């Protein structure tokens, strides 16, 4: 799906924001509310908005692209929300 810009210019961000979260947790084993919480919760909400947006886009009708949805639709976790 590298060819189509929207799926590519949104999934890349799903990974880049995750790198930043992975860095915040990487910073300390001691609990961190030093502005981490402010962005960590912005992040939980931010990742749900984009993660559901591409769930909606996912749902040539390639068997691979459509069938992939059902691993997530086993719980219908994003759609149910």
């Amino acid at each position: 799906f590298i060819l189509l810009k929207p799926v590519f210019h949104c999934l890349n961000e799903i990974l880049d924001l995750c790198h930043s979260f992975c860095s915040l947790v990487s910073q300390n084993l001691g609990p961190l509310d030093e502005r981490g919480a402010a962005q960590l919760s912005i992040l939980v909400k931010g990742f749900s908005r984009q993660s559901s947006l591409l769930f909606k886009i996912l749902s040539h009708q390639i068997n691979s692209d459509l069938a992939q949805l059902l691993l997530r639709l086993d719980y219908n976790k994003y759609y149910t929300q």
């Binding site: 068997n63 691979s64 069938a67 992939q68 059902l70 691993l71 086993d74």
Partner: peptide, 9 residues
Amino acid sequence: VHKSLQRIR
């Protein structure tokens, strides 16, 4: 194999 996961679903 993906069709198998769908079939098992």
